[PDB]
């Protein structure tokens, strides 16, 4: 298999900006290369075939190229609809292989996360398990670090996080961290601290509770 | 199903073959209407076959860059237009030119058309198909010259070129709506630089090369017979034109049987075993022809029966080895098929010239001894080619 | 291109996605199968070449089988011995006069599990500040499709729908909503979790 590593893995920029993608090949693939964009709903649309050829009905801002093993795709003046997923495809040797993709996000809106802790309801403790929910809503960039602590510094490892693609109208992210524990193991501790680290504040934001 | 792409490809293939097979009978009538010397009679076969050797190298890789459909369908039009264009040839020199321009329609077959037949169909199905359509193509060398003789006595010879365009116009519409597109490199840049890099890559593939040469060496004893059986039998053994053409029947009839048997065995034996099953008649027949004519310098029937056994093995083996060699390289098949054909055209051009001089300074024995080492070469190349 | 799929299958079972090809030129251009796992990008499965010649992916060349039907003008992807891995959105791409994979299929979401459309389990989430954030943790349902609505479908200004995740069987999604401190708890806030697959909808009010 000719592995195709696509970079940047993700990228953000405002409108009308000249930004480029890149897929490096494991070995020589010549000019046999495609470029495919995936609309948010999942519709996959091909834009460029055979390294450089724009497909019929694609805006002029798109243009693919080759330099050695590195094949790139540039949008001159980005538009609103262009912020989607983008994959490359190699068809030089079977099996055909795709790239690691690149998901494109808008602008650089900077903000801090609205953290808030939630203990588990007694209705959930009927089943024998407890989930401590911690919402980190409205924050950008998507880069963030979060961690739980069951004491002063006693960390844990059974966390499960869920992010949402950047929200529609405010262009900010959110997260749904949850920690699953047994009713017996849950009630044999008191403090649960939900600490997070994010660029906007060098002072770590904290939210905790005590049963 | 809609597998008339094989059916319509052989129709075009057959049409280019009768463009020379049916014409040579009337070439004396052609050269007399044009008021030219009888030395212009052979140059119409020379011009037609030289056209097939012309654009072989480009049509293949071009069809990788822009598709097997537009290239092939264009050549069908070239054949049809140049078939009718010869009806405006006012002198013999114009005729010979159009003979060569028609001849370019032949190199669309190997490099473009049969590349699509191999990429489109599965392994065992494609070998049944290529072997059986080969028999329909052999109708032209077998019956073309005899049909061309009957044609000129009752109908004008110029009406043959109308017949060629009519069969190819049938073929064009069939190919139009049926021919699959199998080119992977569509939309690629075409330059002499990259085109040169493509052929250097395939010639590095020793396994591919070993199989493409084996197709030349094993088929050379058959072309050496076609090119020299008139001299060997008629002017050498003092046999009639009937008994010469009669000795072609056991040889070319055995070739068809080898394809008919191969076709039926496609589903019942591996391609590796089909080639080996055909390899036994190839060496036995060549040895029968070689050993009997070294003992009996004028044993032309042992030579005919020897080459017939050998001709049976070729029909069994060829269509399989053509497939294996073609896919033995990961290059685009237009470039591969062109390379295979040129590697065979090279073996036939140089090989036949040696066999001509092999028969002069040494009788049928040396002509058959030269045929035997080519079978030994193939055998030795298959030991390298199969593992 | 429209690909009819099963939707749900079990491990160590067989599936059959049938893609119907638009256009008279059905047996001219080749056809591919591409899958998209929920997170792990795109993967090329195989290809059939118009005359029947097949070309599979080496890793999955073990279970894959791509065949055509000249009568009904469609191509099948038949895959054997399934598992969690092969849960993906399977696409039907097609060659063209301009190269490979020029026209793509709609996609059919095929899933590999065992549970029988289990109804969800809704659990509330409650905490004092400038504005208050509330939630609705939903656990234990089988088809990944649930809609949460707040205040009978009136207030959805600062609502965050979170994607569901698999937890050793069944999914555990989450929903969040933010309202000023003056409204709650003096006002009623209820999350209606609609799970059409099990024909259920659950409302749950939040209390501190």
Numbering used by the authors:
A (entry chain L): 1 to 211
B (entry chain A): 14 to 400
C (entry chain H): 4 to 130, 136 to 216
Quote the study on this structure.
The crystal structure of Fab-bound MdfA presented here reveals the transporter in the outward open (Oo) state, with the N- and C-lobes approaching each other closely at the intracellular face of the transporter. The N-terminus of TM5 juxtaposes the C-termini of TM8 and TM10 and the N-terminus of TM11 nestles between the C-termini of TM2 and TM4. Access to the transporter cavity from the cytoplasmic face is sealed off by formation of a hydrophobic plug through intercalation of sidechains from each of these helices centered around Phe340TM10. These contacts are supported by mutually favorable interactions between the side chain of Arg336TM10 and the C-terminal dipole of TM4, and Asp77TM2 and the N-terminal dipole of TM11. Whereas TM5 in the If structure adopts an α-helical conformation of almost ideal geometry up to motif C, residues 136 to 153 in the Oo structure exhibit a profound 15° kink, accompanied by a ca. 45° clockwise twist parallel to the helix axis that terminates with the two-proline-containing motif C. The carboxamide of conserved Asn148TM5 is removed from a (presumably hydrophobic) membrane exposed location in the If state to form hydrogen bonds with the side chain of Asn272TM8 and the main chain carbonyl of Ile269TM8 in the Oo conformation. The largest deviation in TM5 is found at residue Met146TM5, the side chain of which rests against the aromatic moiety of Tyr127TM4 in the present structure. In turn, the side chain hydroxyl of Tyr127TM4 is found within hydrogen bonding distance (2.5 Å) of the carboxylate of Glu26TM1 in the Oo structure. The twisting of the helix in the Oo conformation appears to be prevented from transiting to a straight-form as seen in the If state by juxtaposition of the Tyr127TM4 and Met146TM5 side chains, with the aromatic side chain hydroxyl of Tyr127TM4 held in place by a hydrogen bond to Glu26TM1. We therefore conclude that the outward-open conformation of MdfA is little affected by Fab binding (corroborated by low-resolution data from crystals of MdfA alone) and is stably maintained in a solvated membrane environment.
MdfA, an MFS-MDR transporter from E. coli with homologs in many pathogenic bacteria, is an extensively characterized drug/H+ antiporter. It transports lipophilic, cationic, and neutral substrates, in each case driven by the proton motive force. Typical MFS transporters possess 12 transmembrane helices (TMs) divided into two pseudo-symmetrical 6TM N- and C-terminal lobes. Changes in relative orientation of the two lobes within the plane of the bilayer (the rocker-switch mechanism) allow alternating access to the cytoplasmic and extracellular/periplasmic sides of the membrane, facilitating directed transport of substrates across the membrane, with the transporter cycling between outward open (Oo), inward open (Io) and intermediary occluded states.
